Design an enzyme around this catalytic site. Sequence first.
Site, mmCIF file in Angstrom:
data_model
loop_
_atom_site.group_PDB
_atom_site.id
_atom_site.type_symbol
_atom_site.label_atom_id
_atom_site.label_comp_id
_atom_site.label_asym_id
_atom_site.label_seq_id
_atom_site.Cartn_x
_atom_site.Cartn_y
_atom_site.Cartn_z
ATOM 1 N N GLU A 303 0.817 -1.208 0.000
ATOM 2 C CA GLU A 303 0.000 0.000 0.000
ATOM 3 C C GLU A 303 0.853 1.261 0.000
ATOM 4 O O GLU A 303 0.458 2.273 -0.589
ATOM 5 C CB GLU A 303 -0.943 -0.004 1.202
ATOM 6 C CG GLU A 303 -1.704 -1.309 1.403
ATOM 7 C CD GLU A 303 -2.631 -1.643 0.250
ATOM 8 O OE1 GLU A 303 -3.016 -0.722 -0.503
ATOM 9 O OE2 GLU A 303 -2.982 -2.832 0.098
ATOM 10 N N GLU A 325 -2.366 -2.363 -9.727
ATOM 11 C CA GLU A 325 -2.256 -3.404 -8.713
ATOM 12 C C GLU A 325 -1.143 -4.397 -9.028
ATOM 13 O O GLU A 325 -0.527 -4.938 -8.104
ATOM 14 C CB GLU A 325 -3.588 -4.142 -8.571
ATOM 15 C CG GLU A 325 -4.747 -3.263 -8.127
ATOM 16 C CD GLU A 325 -4.520 -2.639 -6.763
ATOM 17 O OE1 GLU A 325 -3.865 -3.278 -5.914
ATOM 18 O OE2 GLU A 325 -5.011 -1.511 -6.536
HETATM 19 ZN ZN LIG Z 1 -3.214 -2.195 -4.024
#
Ligand SMILES: [Zn+2]
Length: 864
Positions: A303, A325
């Site tokens: 993150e 991602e």
């Molecule tokens: Zn992520």
Amino acid sequence: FERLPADVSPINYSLCLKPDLLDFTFEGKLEAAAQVRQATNQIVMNCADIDIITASYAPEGDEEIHATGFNYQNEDEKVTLSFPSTLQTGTGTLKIDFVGELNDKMKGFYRSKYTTPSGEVRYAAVTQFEATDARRAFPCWDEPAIKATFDISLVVPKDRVALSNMNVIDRKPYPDDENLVEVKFARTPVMSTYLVAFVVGEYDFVETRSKDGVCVRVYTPVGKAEQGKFALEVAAKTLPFYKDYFNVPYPLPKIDLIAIADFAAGAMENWGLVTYRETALLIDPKNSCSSSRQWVALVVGHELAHQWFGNLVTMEWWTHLWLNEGFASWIEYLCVDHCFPEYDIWTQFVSADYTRAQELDALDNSHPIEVSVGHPSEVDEIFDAISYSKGASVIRMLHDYIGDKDFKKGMNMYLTKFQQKNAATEDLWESLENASGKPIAAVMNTWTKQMGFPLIYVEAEQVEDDRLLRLSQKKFCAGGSYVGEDCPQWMVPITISTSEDPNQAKLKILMDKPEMNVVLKNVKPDQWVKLNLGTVGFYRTQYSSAMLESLLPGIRDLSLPPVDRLGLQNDLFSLARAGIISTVEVLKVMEAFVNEPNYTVWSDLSCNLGILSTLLSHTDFYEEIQEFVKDVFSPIGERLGWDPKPGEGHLDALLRGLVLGKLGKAGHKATLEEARRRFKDHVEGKQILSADLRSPVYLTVLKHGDGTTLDIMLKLHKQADMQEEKNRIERVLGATLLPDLIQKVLTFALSEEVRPQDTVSVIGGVAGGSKHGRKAAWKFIKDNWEELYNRYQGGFLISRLIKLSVEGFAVDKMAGEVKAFFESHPAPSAERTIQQCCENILLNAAWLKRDAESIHQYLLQRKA
Ligand SMILES: [Zn+2]
């Protein structure tokens, strides 16, 4: 679907939300500075679960024009605000006060149930906007490419913490309510709406300062500040890593990581206020595991990577979500490997995302990574384990193809160019192509615009002191040779290594042809050649018989790196299952792994051999394959022993459990005898065995036990203190072999003693226990189908129940039986699982019929 008209784009959001706790609502006013790019009489925004009280647009220096036209479209989550006169080109201020709801859907601005250190059960105001849930906290242009700045204000009680993206700049009291205080935060940079965050609740914190000077804090539930200590030091080291790698400092003045009780989304990369679930961020010394410190390092590095790649530079549209991602899923391992090299985290990455992506990409009904996303609901449909795992895998292959030098340079060019802006996938290929001079857009199109991955066959010939390599590529399929006349082709970067230097590249190439020849200079015949160094390339390698035998010493003396031994063994089982090579050839390689010390390699070894053992249970020589398994795991079993040695790691305790359980199931006499000593001393209260040895001992004594052993396990479960001890027994109950005991375990699964969500685990252990146990589990779920269907229909459990029950069948006639059963007794929510399982049964059936007698005659000759 069509995006917003973009005739009026925002500039700055001035928000002040007052979360009305206990009533589960909230009211807030919005002053949005905007620009009218084109003369219009109406403004179209995104909005849901919010009724607007009044709304007016005030152009620069003029009187506001109240909106007399409202249009709520719930199916599209958009609202049109009509006005009497045209707003005309210029800058204005849209003033909108409204009211909302702190819903229970875990989306937007919702309520989060938490319990104080005493009880009472309170609720907190937690946010979650990704993907398109910012429109449920306040009306806005809820699209990632429509960026703007945000002025967040919160009116919270004095006894509650109010956090947001930025730092607090003012904390003035509330005039109408003395019990409330308005907390105003600083102005955010140009950012996307789905990254805005604000949380209201009761939290303790621990703080530190990173080397860059950024204030780092880990917010925990009330009374658990010490548990967020490890996540604090990891985040404090993660920021300088991405700072040095990107050559770009952290864009915000502070970073906060808050652990939330039962956070449904798991983790969200909100800019400056990263939210987690407490079970994934904090480490409870009396509840956590051994590799929990490893899992925390990964989720923090993931993150925090988005704070640059994803938040500073945001995708143009949800079509590029795989790249956002996928990049973070790759660089998180790069960050943990740098700060913690004792994990060898890249071996676990290959075991996780890499192998799982190759399984799905080799079967039917696959899809390319990048798919055009029209409606934002299409996201949740076409992104899965393929777009993310293979997405992270092709990024790793690209980084190795580029080299860390040019890759860092291209990322710095990319971030500085599109900072506080948006970019597409092609924009990243350009920045990397400028810094490296390699055709990145052309190569990556073959890995993103089409499905599947290639199989690289390599053959070797000795020419003087050099070795000529002959390479060819074709689409790999789990069934065998790909049937289809399109003939897919890939631009495959290939890294080659030799025994003289097994840890660095002997030669890096790019295969842009269906066939290609390669000459390795100064390679003596006594040296082995290994393709796909580090298993960085997303492809399988088929070695010739001569080349495979040359690799055997490298496995035995461990000169071949563990990540290479992992990928080599995994490719052999896939090729043998696909009929490309013989299974006997794979079994001869297993004898070279007797010196394997790595836990991840044995985990995949045990998994592949378990598939083969259950497959060969349909034959008349199941004793012969069990004897083969014992010979492979005996040396590693004696090396580890039964008790922890002075100065072991956490993987060595896991590896001991895996090896001992494998030997115990295979009937290893020395293992069976010792397991009975520990089990009889555990039930008599003489010396309780360790939790690491608990599962293997239970499996061993129950498979080789009788009705007395089963009754003891049932007494250990009904008397078990905690739920965790119960689950450890429910998984191993299916190890019993006697038919009347198998029926007793299946009936025990549906009893009141077993909770319904754990019933599938009990039946799953029965299907995986033995051949007759699998047939008894399949017959059990057919006779009790009316009850089982009513239990888990429309949920995840009904697909897991079908998967664990029929995947072990090795008869092609049986695949036609499960398809005929669910055509008369439909299971709609598990329609995709039945097709995958039927294809898997037919795959194991053809595999079994082709190599059965060959394996049999190999095991008999080997024993002599
Ligand atoms: Zn992520």
